Amino acid sequence: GSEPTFVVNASLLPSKVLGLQVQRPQSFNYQPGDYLFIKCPGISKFEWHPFTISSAPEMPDVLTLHIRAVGSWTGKLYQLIREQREEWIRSGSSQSLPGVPVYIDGPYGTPSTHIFESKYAILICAGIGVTPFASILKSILHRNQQNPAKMPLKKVHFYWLNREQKAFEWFVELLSKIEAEDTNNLFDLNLYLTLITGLKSRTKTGRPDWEEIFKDVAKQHAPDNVEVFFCGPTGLALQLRHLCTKYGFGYRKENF
Ligand SMILES: Cc1cc2nc3c(=O)[nH]c(=O)nc-3n(C[C@H](O)[C@H](O)[C@H](O)COP(=O)(O)OP(=O)(O)OC[C@H]3O[C@@H](n4cnc5c(N)ncnc54)[C@H](O)[C@@H]3O)c2cc1C
Numbered sequence: 001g002s003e004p005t006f007v008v009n010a011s012l013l014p015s016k017v018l019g020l021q022v023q024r025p026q027s028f029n030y031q032p033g034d035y036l037f038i039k040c041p042g043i044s045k046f047e048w049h050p051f052t053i054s055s056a057p058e059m060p061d062v063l064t065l066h067i068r069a070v071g072s073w074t075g076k077l078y079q080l081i082r083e084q085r086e087e088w089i090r091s092g093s094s095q096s097l098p099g100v101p102v103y104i105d106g107p108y109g110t111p112s113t114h115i116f117e118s119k120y121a122i123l124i125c126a127g128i129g130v131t132p133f134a135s136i137l138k139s140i141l142h143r144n145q146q147n148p149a150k151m152p153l154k155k156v157h158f159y160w161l162n163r164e165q166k167a168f169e170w171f172v173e174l175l176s177k178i179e180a181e182d183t184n185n186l187f188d189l190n191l192y193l194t195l196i197t198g199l200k201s202r203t204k205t206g207r208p209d210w211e212e213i214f215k216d217v218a219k220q221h222a223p224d225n226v227e228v229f230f231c232g233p234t235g236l237a238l239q240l241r242h243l244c245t246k247y248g249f250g251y252r253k254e255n256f
């Protein structure tokens, strides 16, 4: 529930995305995949919008939100931060940067968190739909550095689709640190534009062949259970749903 706090820093990222840092209340506990609702009196004192927490709960003093300017309230928040930041680089640090006051209500849970309790997982996301998976991947890293035993998760298949290639930069560092530190090959990273990421990962092109991919994973893990988690558009969800029934994978209806 409800608690006053501050956007203390922000990040202006490609495809009109704000990388908000928010002072984490001293009593605020979340799980990776959790989201919250946020109110910004400066934009509207009546409106609450939900955003996935892109930070891992192991990061101790701030929450992260990655928000795309897509309409009225996000457009305005973007403009307010662009202008607050351009004005403080023209004026300068006359005094410490003033932090945008906000209300947060949460955390709210999503079935994505069940990944920490699966053996074999498929994560599929498009554009800003990466954000819950961003939180989950960072958490998995803190969790090997501290207790690889307590992890029943044996393989993670990651598919991230984007129409613009500069959107992969939102999380290119995280993807490096995994590429670097995944000596035991827990992860299978796949980036599609719908090698090129300057990653050891070959950025692929076109709509992926989801039948071919689901078949492949089935053969890797059968007869054990694979879980699918999807954050993206419904047309895709619908194709993925049929495919989960075909190859016997777990599906959650989160797309309507
Ligand atoms: C659990 C959850 C997590 C989320 N996490 C994130 C996240 O991490 N990052 C993120 O960026 N977003 C996230 N979202 C989306 C976010 O919550 C915002 O409310 C929404 O993305 C933007 O609100 P807005 O006022 O800016 O846009 P709106 O003005 O509501 O417009 C939104 C969309 O509707 C279109 N539109 C506008 N008017 C009409 C109309 N009359 N008819 C049809 N279409 C119209 C716009 O072009 C745009 O595509 C999440 C949502 C949920 C439910």
Ligand SMILES: O=C1c2ccccc2-c2cc(N3CCC4(CC3)OCCO4)nc3cccc1c23
Pocket: 052, 068, 070, 110, 128, 129, 130, 131, 132, 231, 254
């Ligand atoms: O978990 C969700 C979610 C769950 C149930 C219903 C909707 C969402 C969800 C929607 C969403 N949108 C809709 C697609 C978008 C970006 C913002 O780009 C085109 C217009 O707005 N963006 C999201 C980004 C991250 C996570 C989610 C979402």
